[PDB]
Amino acid sequence: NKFSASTVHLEHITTALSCLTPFGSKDDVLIFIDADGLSFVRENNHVIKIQLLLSRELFMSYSYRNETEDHMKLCVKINHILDSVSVMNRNSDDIVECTLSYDGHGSPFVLIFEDSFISERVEYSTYLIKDFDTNGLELDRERISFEAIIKGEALHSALKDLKEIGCKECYVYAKTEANDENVFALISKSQLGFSKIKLPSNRSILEKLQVFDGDSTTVIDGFAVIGFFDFTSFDKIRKSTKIASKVLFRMDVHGVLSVNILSPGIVIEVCMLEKESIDEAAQTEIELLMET
């Protein structure tokens, strides 16, 4: 076997996979195996990209026997995996050991589950014909518009409050002041009218927040950054922020936004896409209501 991994605590794996089910449940996940660990990436409509990474120390029997360039790809349907795993991993403290296997290329993804003298073995055939490779919605750190670190619980509560309101179009605000009264909020408009959820300047949920001038070194005060993001991406990310410790916000002048989720724990990084243009001249009325 080229890749092998074993784990005893499947609660972490299943709660990490539950954060991918709102949109990634359909198909077309590109798992990566390397010396760093195990990673899953999902990208639909080329509008949002999610990366969930599993470290070496998470697995107990990581071997990774290879004699190549050390980068092998495989694409498997998520829905088959979810349907297979739904029946197992039942009850609590079932000490279900999961064994991962992949014989390089042309072999199905093999999962072995053992639960109280009862073993299971599911083979997941992959799809590697039209794999265009490369891909990735990456951004350069030399021109980051602003950086923000927020608590996971506050963001989860904000998103779960925003979801049921509606708000098919959402906005992201960034603002810094000289008196350390930093302003950060995710406002939106809906049929209800105007919805404003505000994250205060308290360091409990706004530990770090600075607005840059496109050089990632020159921090400035009194400058406003407007981010027009669709409701779909925020709805998809709401589940991913349900269980977390710290959430990192970072977008550049290009408008693409990278959100890092910390939960040692695993790291989840998601890349977003901004809308082409703001609706007419709305951004003006966003600030005009913000200092109102």
Binding site: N45, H46, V47, F132, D133, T134, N135, G136, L137, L139, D230, T232, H254, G255, V256, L273, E274, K275, E276, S277
Partner: protein, 325 residues
């Protein structure tokens, strides 16, 4: 790796210089992309003329490494329902480009196979989201497209490839594969091409496989006719002469001998017969009508199925009756 693919896919053009025949369209689109102006190109023409190959080469030329995350390719293999179309194209066009300062190109292969409401949504998105997003329409049939779509999109017509383009592609294939064809074989391939490149590549691969050794030999017209199954022009001329001269017995005997010696099909035989008959002159204006109607009925019956001998005798009788006027 290469050298293990069909010649249709192996010889797929990758640059605009590799597309032959449609010099005017290539020059026009090169002038369009040199100015950074893409006015919602629409490509129309018979299959095998190089529409999707041309758009792929253009996307490679103007983007390079941006094809993986800027070009949205949609086709018949993907579901194109009204909700699916509106959601997917709205999400793709409404989002700003990541880093490239250029228009976003969306390729819609086989656009004729969509519903009217989906076409209306697409034509609304074309005019609405157009600041950064452009559209490409590929369809062999224009009757299934909304006339509003043909107005907002610049229509480019793909003519059948002339003899020069086919000859140049044949020469390139021969250079690549180290193969030789007789000039008579080249003329036969030109006649059989009917303005198609995929058919030419397929029959060239089949004829190369037919040869016992690829090298130290020359491809003639006989091997091309044997592998492709197309009747020889001499056989068609002999059949027509027997029909026009031998009344009913030896003409039928000659037709049966021709159909049995090499196993020719009736469809190709009648197609050849009418092809030579089109060159002939008929100063009656009524024999041609009877010929065309009877031959079309014969093709319809053969498509519906029947007896080959009875259909061939019907062809002979129809030709003789039409020429008796």
């Amino acid at each position: 790796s290469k050298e293990n693919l069909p010649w249709v896919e192996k010889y797929r053009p990758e640059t605009l210089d590799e597309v032959y025949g449609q010099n005017e369209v290539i020059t026009t689109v090169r002038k369009f992309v040199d100015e950074g102006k893409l006015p919602h190109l629409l490509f129309y023409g018979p299959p095998g003329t190089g529409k999707t190959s041309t758009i792929v080469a253009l996307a490679r030329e103007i983007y390079g490494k941006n094809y993986s995350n800027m070009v949205l390719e949609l086709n018949a293999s993907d579901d194109r329902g009204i909700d699916v179309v509106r959601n997917q194209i709205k999400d793709f066009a409404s989002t700003r480009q990541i880093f490239s300062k250029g228009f976003k190109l969306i390729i819609l292969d086989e656009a004729d196979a969509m519903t009217n409401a989906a076409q209306n949504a697409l034509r609304r998105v074309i005019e609405r989201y157009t600041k950064n997003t452009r559209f490409c329409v590929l369809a062999n049939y224009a009757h299934k497209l909304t006339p509003a779509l043909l107005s907002r999109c610049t229509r480019f017509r793909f003519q059948p490839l002339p003899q020069e383009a086919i000859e140049r592609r044949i020469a390139n294939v021969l250079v690549h594969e180290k193969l030789k064809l007789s000039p008579n074989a080249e003329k036969a391939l030109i006649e059989l091409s009917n303005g198609d490149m995929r058919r030419v590549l397929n029959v060239l691969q089949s004829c190369k496989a037919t040869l016992d050794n690829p090298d130290e030999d020359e491809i003639s017209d006989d091997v091309i006719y044997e592998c492709c199954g197309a009747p020889r022009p001499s056989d068609l001329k002999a059949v027509l002469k027997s029909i026009l001269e031998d009344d009913w017995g030896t003409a039928h005997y000659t037709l049966n001998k021709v159909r049995s010696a090499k196993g020719l099909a009736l469809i190709d035989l009648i197609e050849g017969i009418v092809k030579i008959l089109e060159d002939y002159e008929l100063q009656n204006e009524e024999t041609r009508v009877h010929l065309l109607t009877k031959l079309a009925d014969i093709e319809y019956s053969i498509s519906k199925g029947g007896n080959d001998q009875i259909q061939g005798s019907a062809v002979i009788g129809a030709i003789k009756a039409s020429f008796e006027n």
